[PDB]
Structures are given as structure tokens and as C-alpha cells.
Amino acid sequence: RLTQLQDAVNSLADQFCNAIGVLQQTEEYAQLFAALIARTAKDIDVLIDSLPSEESTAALQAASLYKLEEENHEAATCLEDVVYRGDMLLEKIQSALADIAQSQLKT
Amino acid sequence: GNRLRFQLELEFVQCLANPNYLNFLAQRGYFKDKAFVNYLKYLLYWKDPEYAKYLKYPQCLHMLELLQYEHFRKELVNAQCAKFIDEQQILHWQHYSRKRMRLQQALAEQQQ
Amino acid sequence: ALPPPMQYIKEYTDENIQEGLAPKPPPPIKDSYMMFGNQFQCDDLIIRPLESQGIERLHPMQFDHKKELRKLNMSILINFLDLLDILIRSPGSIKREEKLEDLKLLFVHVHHLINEYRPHQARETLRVMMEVQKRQRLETAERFQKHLERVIEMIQNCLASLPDDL
Amino acid sequence: RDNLLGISWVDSSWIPILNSGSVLDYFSERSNPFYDRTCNNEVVKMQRLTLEHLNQMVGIEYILLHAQEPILFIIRKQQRQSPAQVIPLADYYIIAGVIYQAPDLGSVINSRVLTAVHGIQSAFDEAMSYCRYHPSKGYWWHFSSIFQRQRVDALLLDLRQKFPPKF
Amino acid sequence: MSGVRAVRISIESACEKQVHEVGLDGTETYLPPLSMSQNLARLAQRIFQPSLWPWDSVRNNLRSALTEMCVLYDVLSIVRDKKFMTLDPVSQDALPPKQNPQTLQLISKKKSLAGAAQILLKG
Amino acid sequence: ARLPSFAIPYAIDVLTTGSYPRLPTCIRDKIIPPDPITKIEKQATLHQLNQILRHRLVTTDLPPQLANLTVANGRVKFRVEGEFEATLTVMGDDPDVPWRLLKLEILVEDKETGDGRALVHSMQISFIHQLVQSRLFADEKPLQD
Amino acid sequence: LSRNEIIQSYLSRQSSLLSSSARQLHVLVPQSPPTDLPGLTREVTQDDLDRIQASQWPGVNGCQDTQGNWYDWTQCISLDPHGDDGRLNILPYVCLD
Amino acid sequence: QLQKQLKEAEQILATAVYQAKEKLKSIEKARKGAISSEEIIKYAHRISASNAVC
């Protein structure tokens, strides 16, 4: 987005330089140049109308990152506690399938 | 002094990120000496964050790790090796950037 | 001239040709001036250097980037129209050099405002990403919780299966 | 200065500013080992918009011979006895902003053959070492069918016909 | 605003997709399938030329000699025609400013005969 | 004058972890050979394989003629005590993996006819090693075939 | 530098237009006198942290647009500011792969 | 039948246990906040000034 904005600002100038160059160097050229400049100018305006005044970024940034660290810790604990017990299932339930297999082979 | 040591080591590690310089050193036979492998092992102190803070060209660190595998230095004497590695590096770089940009732009234009 | 593609391996490697314990240790974090490449690249610096160093500042400290960028876009179009006006009246007038210099000045302030935006974006990215990470961890945990219930559902299915056989 | 054939000289800053007359200028520099600080080519660096200095009076000069716009720019060193009299001395070719001296036919062939014969001799010495062969009816190691197979082949064809191969 | 306070912010590695191989003219390749359930069998599968333990040195040396021979032949075949090549004979003269020849010849003959004598004696 | 985008995930990977997760890995895959597993996982995979072979086995219709099978921790060891001996095994997923007929030892070993020898040329044994194996790679009734 | 060929000039228009590009334009954002840290010294109001995470904040978490469609930072906004078929496509601000 | 059942439910189980163990091994284990809203922005300025990894 920001790279597009910089390129658009640089091009806004491109159509100025190019316009004046063409002039020094017929009516359709000036018409298309004018349309080009106006189009890209309006695009730069509507693109600037995007990035905001903005706020926080620290006060709220710091608070949010601290809350996120706490919640990441608690979520890691929850996912592991589930995981120790999840892996527990496969551990001796596959040994229950091996007990069945041993009893079938012993026959 | 230790300052000159730090500066020269930083320059050397940043220079190691060049496949041309790596092929230079490999052809000139510097890798075959058992002194250079110990110097490389000592150079691993750059992985620390306090030392990595001063690295302008970060692409070197990963490369350094490869140099420890002891099979990367036996090869790379070829020029086709430097060719291929620089090709893949610049390809990853430029294609990642410009492909993200072009994909975003083309999808935004086509969806409209 | 005399120099080749740089002097080859020397000094530190000579030192390194030792054994067990003899080689020198790593250098300390020189927190001052260094010489990477050719630039000094000294430590302790900012991200977007103030435009006050090196150029004039046409914008007050209120700096409401969104409003000033919009004004600067207008000044640039109006200044181009005035440059065309210098061409109507006197091409050789001294003002032509000033107008060409004044439009460039405007194109530079827009880039300084864009540089303010890039950290405004770094700060926002440092803030988020962990919000997406947060949601992904909670969703992965919900999947495991649901999968375990469904695995317990399979357990109860196996219980049904014993009467199912009987 | 040991071997002019085995030297390469460049300048990355000069590489972006490069095409035709630019090449003559780069060669003209000074630090390039091939360029002489004596002879006549030094005085063309002193002269301005000269257009025929090699003819009327003469001397050692460097002139572009063949040129490809992007990279290839070949330079030739001439020694003139008089106008309309040219004697070619050597050729220095610039590939990718890297100057080399054109190798002679005979000199290059002979040196590379010497590198090949030396490798062949090392291989021959290794062969003589590992070979030896003991004089007393021995060799320096240091360095069928039971004819019951016709029925086995019949059984093989039988199982081929019975169990056909399936690709 | 001014005086930003940095806090302990933890970030997870952004390894959602890896580009194992990057082709020319674009065309990204996402070889990594991010699996394990099959990786166990892949590792269970795991559970320098033909031989090349003896005569490796001899082999490599002869290969290198052959390669140099081939390169010279290639350059000679590229001179055989005017395709991307030249042959202009710049009237020059390899002037050796020494008695290199005599000395060279002498030393060469000496060492070659040394090798010969050594071999003979040994045998 | 234009200033560009920040490293962002790249800088994160730099400062925290060191293993560069960007660019291509083909460097390591083409230049560096893989490191081998130790006994810890060698035999671990061996026993997971025991288990899966057990599954495939209880899944087919083993011949009632003999089918003397022992897991041998890696091979079913299908052995007639009569004149044939084979060791079939699987290579992966139970739905569609083919079989592997590693050994084709012939049990018919008489000491009155063949003294200090086998009973058939090894090459003819190696022919059934690629023939019955290609027949079982059909995946149609392999145990009976 | 003469250029000015009808063909050479025509290439310039297409290249320049491609990079740049009923209102369908983003909703005008009124200026906020107090910012979250310096302006309102509100410091962290847990409410602000909750609002950014899930609520729609017009400029902190997204761009409102007109027609009501809400575009978050990761998403790409397609809009048509000029009264013409051609539409400005605004690529994602964050672009997190 | 019970074996087909165990296999399907527990292949799902292997995938879930694997999400969990990706966790145990890495994600949701180290959780180190060392260096963040300071040095990374500095490195931002750094590689932006270095158009080779930029």
C-alpha cells in the first residue's frame, strides 16, 4: 500500500514533467495528459484518505502485547494439557490393539 | 586491538554471504586447511542477538551454518555452484517481493 | 591498479591455526563507530531522520499527516499550474528556477510523511500478528477439544459395539 | 608484471558507465597494467578531440577492433611505422567489464597440454604403485552352472506362463 | 507519544509455507507438504560411484586429464570455424630474455631420468 | 528518496530464531546429504512396522496349507517346511501399498542328491525374485498368488 | 529525448494508468482530537484494547468504505473513485503472506 | 470392525496429538519476548537501508 502510494506520488510528477516536455517539443496529447494527471491525483487523494490519524501503538500497544503474552502462555498450557492426555490415548490404546493382535496370533 | 578484530570479523562474515567470494576461497584452497574450519566454528558467535544487532547483510548467517556441514566446502569449488546459489538467492528475493506485489494487484483488478 | 579482488585470508586465520585451547575469543559489542563496507554505520540512531536536517520545513508541529499530505498534494498541483503561468509570461524570469525548486521541496515533504507512516506501520504490525497468532492457537485448541470429544464419541461407539455384537 | 596473460583488472564503479568510446577511455585510464605510461597512447590522454593521431607520425597505439554494444569490446595494440602502415602487436579483449589478454594459439595449447600430461603422469605413478604384481607367480593384493539349470529354466518358463508379468 | 516504552513482546516463527525450490521465469514451488503421519513411514524407508573405495585417486586423476583434453578439443573445434571466434595473427614474437631453455631442458631430463632409474632399481 | 517496506516477519525470524526460513532449501537438499537415524528410531520404526504388517496380515486370507508365519520384528517369514520359503512385507499405507518379496530360499535340500551344494542355480531363484514379486505387485490376491 | 511518436506517447499513457489504476469511495474519517496515548492520556483503557481486537474501529482496525462493506487491513479494497469502468484496487496494508 | 473404528478415530487422534506436539516441541513452549518494539524497528530501518535483503 505505502509503496503504491510512493509510486503514485512519483508518477503524479511523471505526468507533470512529461506534460511540460510534450508542450516544449496535438490537442489529443494535452487532453490525455490532463486526464492522466487528474486521474492519478484523485487516486492519490483516495489512497491518502485510507491511512488514518491512528492512536495507541504503545499505551494500548504495550497493554495489548502484555495481555497477548499472558494469553499465549495460558493457551500453550491448555493445548499441551490436552496434548499430554491426547498422546496418552494413542500410547496404550495402540497397545490394546497389540494385545488383541497378540491374542489373535497366539491362537 | 579488539575493535579492529570485531570490525574485520564483521566485514568478513558479511562478505561470506557472497557466492563469488566463497568460490574464490574454495578454489584457492583455504577451506581444505584445518585452521579455517576452526575459525568458522569460532565465528558462530554472531548468532547471538547482541552480535546479530550489528549485521547489515543478514543473509550470511544461514550460509555460515552450511559451511559447518563439511560437505559444503568439499563442493562449491565449481563455478556452476556459485551460479546456482546466487540464482536461487536473487530469485527468492526478487520473486518474493514482486510476486507478492503483482499477485495482490492482479487479484484486486480481476475481482473488480 | 595494484590491488587485486581484496587481500586473501590472513591474520585471524593465522591466529586460528592452533589446537584444543590457544585461539583468541570473540570481540566485544563495540557500541560506537564501525566500518562495514565503506559507510561508517555507527550505532545509536533513529529510523526517519527529521527533514529539519538538510532541508527547510514547511509544516508545523501539529503535523496531522492526513491533512498536511492532502494540502501538499494540492500545493503541488497549484504550483505546477503556476510553473505553466511562468511559461506564459516570462520563460527566462528568475522565478522559474524558484518554482522548479519549490515543487521539488513539496515532493520531498510527502516522502517524509510517508516515512512517518512506515513506523506507524511497524508499530501496528508489532501490535497485531500476535492477534492472528492468538486466534489460531485458540482455534487449534478448540479442534483438539472437539477431536477428543469425538474420540470419546468413538469410545462410546465402541461401548455400543459390545452390545452390538452381543 | 610476472605474466600479462595471467592478469585481470577491473573497476566496478566504471562498469555502469560503459559502451563504445567509453571503452577506449577506460583502457586509456593508467592503472590498467596493459596500458603503458610511456609510448604514444599516454599522449592521446593529454590531447583533446584528436581524430587521426595514429597516422602522419606514429608509435604504439591502442584502437578498438570489434565491438558488441552490451559487453564485448576488443582492443588491439598497433605499432605504426608510417601512415597507412600498421603492425599488430597484441589483442586485449574485455568481457563483462573484465579485461583479459587474448591467448596465443601455440602458447595456450602447449601450456594446457603440459597440465594434461602432468595429470596423466600422476595417474601413471599411482598405477605403478598399486600395480607391482609379485615376481614369484603372484599379484600384489595390497594395491558357473551346476548344469541342472535346464529343468530350472523349464520351471521358470512354466511359472511365467502360469503367472504372467503385469506391468 | 514521545519516549516509547518497549515491553516483552513474544512473536511466533512465520513458517506457514516454505519454498523448497525456486524456478526461473517465476513459477514458485511449494514442495513441503507439512506432514508427519506419513513421515513416520518415510523415515521407516530410511531404516561416491559404483564401489569407488579402491583406485578412487587414479579414477579422478584420469577423469580430470580427459576433461582438460576435451576442453582443448572444444576450443580447437570452435576455431575450426568462424562461429563466435577469431584467428587474426597479430605479428608478435615470444621474446624470452634469459637462458631458460638450456636450464629447463637439463633439469627436466635429470628428474625424468631420476624417476626412470628409481622405478628400474625398485623392480 | 523513496523509503521501502520493513523486514517484519523476516526481522522476526532474524532476531529470535537464526535458521533462515526464507529463500530456497534446494541448496541443502542438493548439496548436503541427510543425517542417519540412531537405534532409538531405527528399531522404533521397526516395531511400528511390526504393527502395520500385523494389520495387513490379519486383513488377508492366508493359505490354510501351512502359512508358518513369524513376525521376526521385520518380516512375516512365510515358510513351508517342504520346498519353499519366502519373506513378504509391505512398504507403507495399508490400503494400496504393494508387497516386497525379499527372500526366495528353496527348502528342498536333499543330502543324498545335492552334496555340498543347493539344488538349483541362484540366478533361477533370482528370476522368481523378480517374477512372483512383480505378480504380487499386481495387488490382486497377492498372498494366494 | 525527442520521443513524441504517436506510438511512443501511447505506451506512456497505458503504463502510467496501470500503476495508478456513484462514488464507491471510503467514508470520510473525522479527525480525532485525543489519541490513545498522548491525546487522551487515556493510557490503556482496557476498553480500547478490547475494541481493537474484535470491535470495528474505523481507522485503527480497518477502512469503512461506502455501501457498508467493511475491509480489514489484511484484505484488498476494490473501489471506483472516478466515474469510469476502471476501478482503483487498493492492495492489502499488512500483506502477511 | 472395532479395529477399523480405532484406526479412523485415532488417525484423527494422531493428527490432533501432532498439533499438540508441534506445540510441545516449539510453538507455545519457548515464548520468549526478548527484543521487540525497539530493536526490530531498528532492523527495519537497517534492511530498508540495505536493498540486498530489500
Swiss-Prot record, chain A:
<dbReference type="GO" id="GO:0061630">
    <property type="term" value="F:ubiquitin protein ligase activity"/>
</dbReference>
<dbReference type="GO" id="GO:0000151">
    <property type="term" value="C:ubiquitin ligase complex"/>
</dbReference>
<comment type="similarity">
    <text>Belongs to the Mediator complex subunit 21 family.</text>
</comment>
<dbReference type="GO" id="GO:0060261">
    <property type="term" value="P:positive regulation of transcription initiation by RNA polymerase II"/>
</dbReference>
<dbReference type="GO" id="GO:0005634">
    <property type="term" value="C:nucleus"/>
</dbReference>
<dbReference type="InterPro" id="IPR037212">
    <property type="entry name" value="Med7/Med21-like"/>
</dbReference>
<dbReference type="GO" id="GO:0051123">
    <property type="term" value="P:RNA polymerase II preinitiation complex assembly"/>
</dbReference>
<dbReference type="InterPro" id="IPR021384">
    <property type="entry name" value="Mediator_Med21"/>
</dbReference>
<dbReference type="GO" id="GO:0001824">
    <property type="term" value="P:blastocyst development"/>
</dbReference>
<keyword id="KW-0804">Transcription</keyword>
<comment type="function">
    <text>Component of the Mediator complex, a coactivator involved in the regulated transcription of nearly all RNA polymerase II-dependent genes. Mediator functions as a bridge to convey information from gene-specific regulatory proteins to the basal RNA polymerase II transcription machinery. Mediator is recruited to promoters by direct interactions with regulatory proteins and serves as a scaffold for the assembly of a functional preinitiation complex with RNA polymerase II and the general transcription factors.</text>
</comment>
<comment type="subunit">
    <text>Interacts with PPARG. Component of the Mediator complex, which is composed of MED1, MED4, MED6, MED7, MED8, MED9, MED10, MED11, MED12, MED13, MED13L, MED14, MED15, MED16, MED17, MED18, MED19, MED20, MED21, MED22, MED23, MED24, MED25, MED26, MED27, MED29, MED30, MED31, CCNC, CDK8 and CDC2L6/CDK11. The MED12, MED13, CCNC and CDK8 subunits form a distinct module termed the CDK8 module. Mediator containing the CDK8 module is less active than Mediator lacking this module in supporting transcriptional activation.</text>
</comment>
Curated annotation (Swiss-Prot), chain C:
<keyword id="KW-0832">Ubl conjugation</keyword>
<keyword id="KW-0804">Transcription</keyword>
<dbReference type="GO" id="GO:0051123">
    <property type="term" value="P:RNA polymerase II preinitiation complex assembly"/>
</dbReference>
<dbReference type="GO" id="GO:0061630">
    <property type="term" value="F:ubiquitin protein ligase activity"/>
</dbReference>
<dbReference type="GO" id="GO:0060261">
    <property type="term" value="P:positive regulation of transcription initiation by RNA polymerase II"/>
</dbReference>
<keyword id="KW-0805">Transcription regulation</keyword>
<keyword id="KW-1017">Isopeptide bond</keyword>
<dbReference type="GO" id="GO:0070847">
    <property type="term" value="C:core mediator complex"/>
</dbReference>
<dbReference type="GO" id="GO:0006357">
    <property type="term" value="P:regulation of transcription by RNA polymerase II"/>
</dbReference>
<dbReference type="GO" id="GO:0032968">
    <property type="term" value="P:positive regulation of transcription elongation by RNA polymerase II"/>
</dbReference>
<dbReference type="GO" id="GO:0035019">
    <property type="term" value="P:somatic stem cell population maintenance"/>
</dbReference>
<keyword id="KW-0010">Activator</keyword>
Swiss-Prot record, chain E:
<comment type="subunit">
    <text>Interacts with GATA1 and PPARG. Component of the Mediator complex, which is composed of MED1, MED4, MED6, MED7, MED8, MED9, MED10, MED11, MED12, MED13, MED13L, MED14, MED15, MED16, MED17, MED18, MED19, MED20, MED21, MED22, MED23, MED24, MED25, MED26, MED27, MED29, MED30, MED31, CCNC, CDK8 and CDC2L6/CDK11. The MED12, MED13, CCNC and CDK8 subunits form a distinct module termed the CDK8 module. Mediator containing the CDK8 module is less active than Mediator lacking this module in supporting transcriptional activation.</text>
</comment>
<comment type="similarity">
    <text>Belongs to the Mediator complex subunit 17 family.</text>
</comment>
<comment type="function">
    <text>Component of the Mediator complex, a coactivator involved in the regulated transcription of nearly all RNA polymerase II-dependent genes. Mediator functions as a bridge to convey information from gene-specific regulatory proteins to the basal RNA polymerase II transcription machinery. Mediator is recruited to promoters by direct interactions with regulatory proteins and serves as a scaffold for the assembly of a functional preinitiation complex with RNA polymerase II and the general transcription factors.</text>
</comment>
<protein>
    <recommendedName>
        <fullName>Mediator of RNA polymerase II transcription subunit 17</fullName>
    </recommendedName>
</protein>
UniProtKB/Swiss-Prot annotation, chain H:
<comment type="subunit">
    <text>Component of the Mediator complex, which is composed of MED1, MED4, MED6, MED7, MED8, MED9, MED10, MED11, MED12, MED13, MED13L, MED14, MED15, MED16, MED17, MED18, MED19, MED20, MED21, MED22, MED23, MED24, MED25, MED26, MED27, MED29, MED30, MED31, CCNC, CDK8 and CDC2L6/CDK11. The MED12, MED13, CCNC and CDK8 subunits form a distinct module termed the CDK8 module. Mediator containing the CDK8 module is less active than Mediator lacking this module in supporting transcriptional activation.</text>
</comment>
<comment type="function">
    <text>Component of the Mediator complex, a coactivator involved in the regulated transcription of nearly all RNA polymerase II-dependent genes. Mediator functions as a bridge to convey information from gene-specific regulatory proteins to the basal RNA polymerase II transcription machinery. Mediator is recruited to promoters by direct interactions with regulatory proteins and serves as a scaffold for the assembly of a functional preinitiation complex with RNA polymerase II and the general transcription factors.</text>
</comment>
<protein>
    <recommendedName>
        <fullName>Mediator of RNA polymerase II transcription subunit 4</fullName>
    </recommendedName>
</protein>
<comment type="similarity">
    <text>Belongs to the Mediator complex subunit 4 family.</text>
</comment>
